[PDB]
Write a protein that binds this DNA or RNA. Sequence first.
RNA 1: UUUUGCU
Length: 56
Amino acid sequence: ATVVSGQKQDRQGGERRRSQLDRDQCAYCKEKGHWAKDCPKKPRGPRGPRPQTSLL
RNA sequence: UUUUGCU
Ligand SMILES: [Zn+2]
């Protein structure tokens, strides 16, 4: 696959209180057990790799 | 809406 870093302006690095984000919690839905990267509410699947919807 | 969490 292709992967290239374009340009940047304001670097990222969010870190300032997270309620109680547990090491075994989700920072997406707020679920306990799965990770955000494993959140079943992620813009992935079942078919159609394209986040950020356009039409309602 | 929420990935603000090292492989
Ligand atoms: Zn989740």
